[PDB]
């Protein structure tokens, strides 16, 4: 399921999961969603095209299933528009 969104980068992560390095961003749209990328700076206004992932995981403490949604950029792009 594809999504096209506009907003401001509020945070940046250089991270790792499942043997792969990833860059993540917090996009403020006020709500936020994480962008996951497998010239974008803090405070940049961006347009993002990618796949909306609900990304449900079981909470360690409550043992309840929650979504941890993200836009998957692989096909996909994030372009500075500010």
């Amino acid at each position, epitope marked *: 399921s594809n999504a096209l969104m506009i907003g401001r980068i509020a*945070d*940046v*992560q*250089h*991270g*790792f*999961l*499942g043997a792969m*390095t*990833v860059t*993540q961003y*917090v996009l403020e749209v006020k709500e*936020f969603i*994480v962008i*996951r990328c497998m010239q974008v700076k803090l405070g940049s206004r961006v347009l993002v095209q990618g796949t909306l992932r609900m*990304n449900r*995981h079981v909470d*360690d*403490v409550s043992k309840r299933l929650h979504a*941890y949604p993200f836009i998957q950029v692989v096909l996909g792009y994030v372009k500075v528009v500010g």
Partner: nanobody, 127 residues
Framework: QVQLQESGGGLVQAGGSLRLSCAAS????????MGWFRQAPGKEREFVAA????????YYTDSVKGRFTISRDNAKNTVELQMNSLKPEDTAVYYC????????????????????WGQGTQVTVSS
């Protein structure tokens, strides 16, 4: 609004072991990725080990792989570093750190992206 406090440091002989522990207090709900770092006098602070919020993903600097193990207890708000087969090269002040970046499974591996720091604990390994 977050305090990190290390414990478990000290002196050991080469080949020995230590277990470091870090306890998080205050606004712990804001914390996600947790990590251990180290710094020797006159040197830059370096990444040692880090662990995702959910504990599923870990990352280690090359020189500690197979020797150090990071783990966390989200019910106690602690993060721990089991250090086996210690070498003189591991001598440094060790710091625990916490990242506010909101992600369940992805571990932060960039030093400057961590937001809170403990006061540090000295680890010394004699030859």
């Amino acid at each position: 609004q977050v305090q990190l406090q290390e414990s478990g440091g000290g002196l050991v002989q080469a080949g020995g072991s230590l277990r470091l522990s870090c306890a998080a207090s205050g606004r712990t709900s804001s914390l996600y990725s947790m990590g251990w770092f180290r710094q020797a006098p006159g040197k830059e602070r370096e990444f040692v080990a880090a662990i995702s919020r959910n504990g599923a993903n870990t990352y280690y600097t090359d020189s500690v792989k197979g020797r150090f193990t990071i783990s966390r207890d989200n019910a106690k708000n602690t993060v721990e570093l089991q250090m086996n087969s210690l070498k003189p090269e591991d001598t440094a002040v060790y710091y625990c750190a916490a990242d506010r970046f909101p992600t369940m499974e992805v571990v932060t591996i960039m030093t400057n992206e961590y937001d809170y720091w403990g006061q540090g604990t000295q680890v010394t390994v004699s030859s």
